[PDB]
């Protein structure tokens, strides 16, 4: 439990906590802590937290002092097309690898660093000391859980032992699941989707004869029996939903999730038992493979018509070898290809996220306070993170959903494309933490220096197509006068049809500065910081604490990128608590926060021309929160009130100068600090003791005070917070059993609609000119669910846990989750006409069994 820093405005979770709660997924952890949100990445993975009215790189994510890869979204490709893109996802952490996580609302930059603008999330690698004990000289643990919602199953085991000074800890975790099923009623077995199919042409000029099908000689012999041209006609077909293909898709796309995590933590105890020298090796690889079902598998005469109106008719259209009529139905593709009606297209994303971190740690500990430090530690970590997008498209199967199929001679009209975009980061980090004390003083020193990099590669980008070789030719002609076949029954065309010719172009270009440019975008640099914070206790009556920290970072690139040493950001926090008691007491908190430009924002906007790197200030934030709390037999009941100010916010836009005396935009598009907005929330939570057997109550709400722009800027949009999760109440009621071993719990989460004052905004152009915009096409609306959990630890070693979430079915659509639509989301969905696809799960059962020795 708590607590490194008086005040509050944060929560704690422990391995045991997590387990009791049965959290297998990132969505799970914060499900009961209203005002914290997950932020879907649209391909089904994470991509950060949303807190205090912000999200993404605006809120930090740390593990054992090592920050986690940022959200990097590369600029959109043009023409065509449908390209892979950048994952934009943020690394997921294996909870079976962690001890107790700390979450904090409001600017945490003081103890987090950059990115702590809206809040912070910090993790802890599990300690070998989990062999406990005391007594036991070693330990072994096993966890097997099954989630019904995602039809997932997870298995983790941790074995550890400590011999003399030496010690070793090994954890392996693995998981297979996918797709997170919705409320059954979301959709069932329907719709239509017209699809193009071959029919005889009906024109009188539509007859033809193919060469290879005339055994004897020539046109005049073979003509006697001509084939008739085929023409496209769509027919209404009916399938099944889950088999259907968007738009109007009532489902969330198929997802295959898989993950493997390894943790090795040796440590050696040095001589006199104070000193500890140990090391760590972690590898966690998670994969998300999906198929976008929003993409119509078939044509569709409408598409054919589009292409006819643009490029006109195609040679051989309607002509077919033998009886094979779909042979005649094909149209204009992309990248100069003709795609056959007889195949169907599919789009697949194979997204793979790898984290690899190995390092050494040394810890000196003395008791009681004697030396210049009660607790001292040096930490060196080498970590790396990567996200491999790998988009593929194929139109070479019945589809059939085939991702392997490709273009070949035997498949005349086939198509294929592959676009792979890989974003990664690495850290080499030294950090030292020292804690000295006096008895009421608690001193804290935190130091660090790192060599870091962010590398974006673009590779495996190319296309393939076979196109049927065909010719319409005219017969001799021995006579001194020549006939031009018009296709009339008596004068059919003389046609050659042949194998598809396979061709593969490379799509990768260099120096063009657009999506298609594959030159590595690399950013390297050094960063240090010196942080000191101390708190003190005055009698029984009060407690105060304060901290100050200095950061410095310099980044180089070999390009005209926006890199620069960002300036000496210095931060602080102060806090107090009064204890007049009565069982009551009061609290006040103030802290500063900041974020440096996302490496994406540093790479710049890039219209395909030369661009200047325009240096940009960091995003800035100020948080003040005041609260009161009632301690006692019943428990603590806390109420909090907060104001967060945000300034120098980064957006794509233009500079604004005045003269004449009107405004003039200059000179080039890029990401600048154009704006500021303020929010104020209120957060209550308390846990009663009733002297049934207990219950817990949490409530949170957030309001938007104002939004204002740098006024030297323009073409900036406006803010549009879509990220604030609608206010909700969470009320649990539960019964344990002093030792008993068995337990029961129930929870009620209620959310109110959404506004709609937060989905609005203006583009803010020159003069009093601006266009009204919105983040989304519709609001979410209010809903409530009740979850019920239980567990029994028969023969206490083995503990079984069960739960039923959304006990009532209560079909609803959460806004999380629909945030995926528009609003410049990391990966945007469209056109989403239905919205049923965004429904939350119906009743679902999660079953877990843990055992330890």
């Amino acid at each position: 439990r708590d607590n490194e820093v008086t005040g509050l405005g944060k929560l704690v979770k422990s391995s045991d906590t997590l387990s009791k709660e049965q959290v297998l997924n990132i969505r799970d952890l914060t499900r009961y802590d209203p005002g914290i949100a997950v932020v879907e990445q649209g391909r089904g993975a994470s991509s950060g937290y949303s807190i205090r009215g912000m999200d993404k790189n605006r809120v930090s994510l740390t593990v054992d002092g090592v920050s986690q890869i940022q959200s990097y979204t590369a600029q959109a490709a043009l023409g065509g097309t449908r390209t892979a893109g950048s994952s934009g996802a943020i690394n997921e952490i294996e909870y079976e690898n962690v001890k107790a996580v700390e979450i904090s609302k409001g600017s945490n930059s003081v103890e987090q660093g950059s990115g702590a603008l809206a809040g912070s999330v910090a993790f802890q690698t599990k300690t070998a000391d989990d062999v406990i004990g005391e007594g036991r000289q070693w330990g072994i643990q096993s966890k097997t859980a099954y989630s019904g919602k995602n039809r997932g199953l997870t298995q983790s085991i941790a074995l550890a032992g400590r011999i003399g000074g030496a010690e070793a800890l090994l954890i392996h975790t693995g998981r297979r699941a996918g797709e997170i099923r919705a409320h059954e009623d979301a959709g069932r077995g329907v719709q239509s989707f017209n699809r193009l199919v071959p029919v005889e042409d009906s024109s009188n000029y539509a007859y033809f004869i193919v060469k290879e099908e005339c055994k004897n000689g020539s046109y005049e012999t073979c003509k006697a029996n001509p084939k008739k041209d085929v023409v496209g006609k769509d027919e209404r077909q009916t399938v099944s939903t889950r088999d259907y293909t968007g738009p109007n898709r009532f489902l969330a796309d198929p997802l295959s999730y898989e993950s493997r995590s390894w943790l090795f933590r040796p440590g050696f105890r040095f001589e006199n038992k104070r000193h500890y020298i140990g090391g760590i090796l972690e590898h966690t690889q998670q994969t998300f493979d999906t198929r976008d079902m929003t993409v119509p598998a078939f044509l569709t005469k409408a598409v054919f018509d589009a292409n006819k109106k643009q490029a006109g008719s195609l040679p051989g259209n309607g002509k077919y070898a033998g009886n094979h009529k779909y042979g005649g139905l094909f149209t204009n593709g992309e990248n100069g290809a003709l795609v056959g009606a007889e195949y169907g297209t599919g789009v697949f994303y194979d997204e793979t996220h790898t984290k690899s971190r190995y390092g050494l740690e040394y810890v000196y500990t003395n008791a009681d306070k004697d030396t210049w430090a009660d607790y001292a530690r040096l930490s060196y970590d080498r970590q790396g993170v990567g996200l491999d997008n790998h988009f593929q498209q194929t139109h070479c199967s019945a589809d059939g959903s085939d991702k392997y199929c490709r273009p070949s001679a035997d498949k005349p009209f086939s198509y294929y494309k592959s676009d792979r975009v890989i974003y990664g980061e690495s850290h080499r980090l030294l950090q030292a933490a020292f804690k000295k004390s006096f008895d009421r003083h608690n001193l804290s020193v935190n130091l660090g220096f790192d060599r870091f990099g962010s590398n974006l590669r673009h590779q495996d980008y190319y296309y393939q197509h076979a196109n049927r070789a065909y010719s319409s030719n005219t017969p001799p002609q021995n006579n001194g006068k020549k006939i031009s076949p018009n296709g009339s029954e008596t004068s059919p065309y003389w046609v050659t049809i042949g194998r598809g010719n396979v061709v593969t172009g490379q799509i990768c270009r260099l120096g063009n500065n657009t999506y298609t440019d594959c030159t590595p975008r690399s950013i390297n640099g050094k960063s240090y910081y010196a942080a000191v914070r101390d708190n003190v206790r005055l009698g029984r009556w009060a407690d105060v604490g304060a901290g100050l920290r200095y950061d410095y970072r310099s980044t180089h690139s070999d390009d005209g990128s926006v890199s620069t040493g960002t300036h000496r950001t210095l931060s602080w926090n102060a806090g107090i608590v009064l204890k007049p008691t009565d069982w009551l007491d009061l609290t006040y908190r103030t802290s500063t926060g900041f974020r440096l430009p996302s490496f994406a924002e540093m790479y710049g906007w890039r219209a395909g021309v030369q661009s200047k790197a325009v240096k940009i200030d960091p995003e800035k934030s100020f948080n003040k929160e005041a609260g009161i709390v009632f301690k006692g037999d019943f428990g603590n009941l806390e109420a909090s009130w907060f104001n967060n100010a945000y300034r120098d916010l980064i957006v794509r836009g233009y500079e604004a100068q005045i003269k004449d005396g009107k405004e003039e935009a200059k000179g080039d598009p890029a990401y600048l600090n154009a704006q500021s907005a303020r929010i104020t929330g209120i957060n209550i939570l308390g846990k009663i003791d009733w002297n049934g057997w207990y219950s817990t109550f949490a409530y949170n709400r957030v309001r938007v005070r104002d939004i204002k722009k740098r006024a030297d800027r323009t073409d900036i949009q406006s803010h549009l917070f879509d990220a604030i999760q609608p206010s909700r109440y969470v009320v649990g009621l539960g019964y344990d059993q002093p030792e008993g071993k068995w337990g029961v719990n129930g929870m009620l989460t209620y959310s109110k609609a959404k506004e709609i004052t937060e989905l609005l905004g203006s583009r803010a152009l020159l003069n009093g000119n601006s266009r009204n915009t919105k983040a989304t096409a519709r609001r979410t609306r209010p809903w409530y669910i009740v979850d019920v959990s239980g567990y029994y630890t028969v023969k206490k070693h083995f503990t079984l846990r069960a739960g039923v979430y959304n006990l009532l079915n209560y079909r609803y659509v959460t806004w999380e989750n629909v945030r995926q639509t528009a609003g410049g989301a990391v990966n945007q969905h469209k056109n989403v006409g239905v919205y049923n696809r965004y429904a939350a799960p119906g009743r679902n059962y999660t079953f877990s069994l843990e055992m330890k020795f």
């Binding site: 959109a76 490709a77 043009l78 023409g79 065509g80 097309t81 390209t83 042409d201 009906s202 024109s203 009188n204 000029y205 539509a206 018509d305 006819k308 109106k309 643009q310 490029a311 006109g312 008719s313 195609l314 051989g316 309607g318 204009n332 992309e334 990248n335 100069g336 296309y463 319409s472 005219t474 020549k482 031009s484 018009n486 296709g487 009339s488 065309y493 799509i507 270009r509 063009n512 657009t514 298609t516 906007w605 219209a607 395909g608 021309v609 405004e663 003039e664 935009a665 000179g667 080039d668 598009p669 073409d715 583009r763 020159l766 000119n769 266009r771 009204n772 915009t773 919105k774 469209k830």
Partner: protein, 339 residues
């Protein structure tokens, strides 16, 4: 450098409105100046009143002699590198009924003709330019027994076919029904022997793609193409039987502003271009309130030009020599002055 705004010449009221919304959203990076006709428009360009516009092959030729230069081309193909790859343009074709008789390229004399408009690329410049060497004089009223050429003298034999009533009969604009590629094809089906149009015209107006009653039952397969060698080919065969190939629409500007317009325009397309296209609550550059405005709606991206800097290299051999032998004699005032 501090590139100043670019003025766009809007040929119509709607071209103007679109250009306005553009202006605003561009935050003045682009501004507009209206014109009565496409020609005087290119003139306002000439003197410095306007910085650019986009126009078809023939007009590209005219401005070309006027000393302007094409910066960027309109590309309608879907490609992963749209901007990099240059497009081959389109084909002018002479279309006839497959059920029509003996008509051949050489024997067109006395036949009834359907044209898009006078002075325009495929409906006039190319065909009349190729026949000019045959007849080698300037009166085309004499060659065909009759036809529809929109913009021709009202008492001209070439207005004899054109539909429409009163003053607008034979008019260069939609007031006249046989105006355009569309109007020309309609003319072919209802009246004329031959139609001079692009190779997309027939599929466009047949197969139910055109709602109007005269079309929509019309079978593309029922029409063919006249080849310069006397033979015929199907409509989808235009590549191997056609009069000449025109280039894609392109944007032109004076030599100095060339680099600038080039620069700003690309930014503009990345802001408002193909994707993002959300034309609902945002501004889309290529989408239009009515029809192609300042750009063909079919536009995907604006592309660079590898070997063709000059209007002559741009238009290509086939275009010229099918034209410029035609004018020679052209009643356009701007061309005369330009010479």
């Amino acid at each position: 450098d501090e590139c100043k705004p670019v003025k766009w010449c809007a040929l119509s009221h709607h071209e103007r409105l679109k250009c306005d919304e553009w202006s605003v959203n561009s935050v003045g990076k682009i501004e507009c100046v209206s014109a009565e006709t496409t020609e005087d428009c290119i003139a306002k360009i000439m003197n410095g009143e306007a910085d650019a516009m986009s126009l078809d092959g023939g007009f590209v030729y005219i401005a070309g002699k006027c000393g302007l230069v094409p910066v960027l081309a309109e590309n309608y193909n879907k490609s992963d590198n749209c901007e990099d790859t240059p497009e081959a343009g389109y084909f002018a074709v002479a279309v006839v009924k497959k059920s029509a008789s003996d008509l051949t390229w050489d024997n067109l004399k006395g036949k009834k003709s359907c044209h898009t408009a006078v002075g325009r690329t495929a409906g006039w410049n190319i065909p009349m330019g190729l026949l000019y060497n045959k007849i080698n004089h300037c009166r085309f009223d004499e060659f065909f027994s009759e036809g529809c050429a929109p913009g021709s003298k009202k008492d001209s034999s070439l207005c004899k076919l054109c539909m429409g009533s009163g003053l607008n009969l034979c008019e260069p604009n939609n007031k006249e029904g046989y105006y355009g590629y569309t109007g020309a094809f309609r003319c072919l089906v209802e009246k004329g022997d031959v139609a001079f149009v692009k190779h997309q015209t027939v599929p466009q107006n047949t197969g139910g793609k055109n709602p109007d009653p005269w079309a929509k039952n019309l079978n593309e397969k029922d029409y063919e193409l006249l080849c310069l060698d006397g033979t015929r080919k199907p409509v989808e065969e235009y590549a191997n039987c056609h009069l000449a190939r025109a280039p894609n629409h392109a944007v032109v500007t004076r030599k100095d502003k060339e680099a600038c317009v080039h620069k700003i325009l690309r930014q503009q397309q990345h802001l408002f271009g193909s994707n993002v296209t959300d034309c609902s609550g945002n501004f889309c550059l290529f989408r239009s309130e009515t029809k192609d405005l300042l750009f063909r709606d079919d536009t995907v991206c604006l592309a660079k030009l590898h070997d063709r800097n000059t209007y002559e290299k741009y238009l290509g051999e086939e275009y010229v020599k099918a034209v410029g032998n035609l004018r020679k004699c052209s009643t356009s005032s701007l061309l005369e002055a330009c010479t």
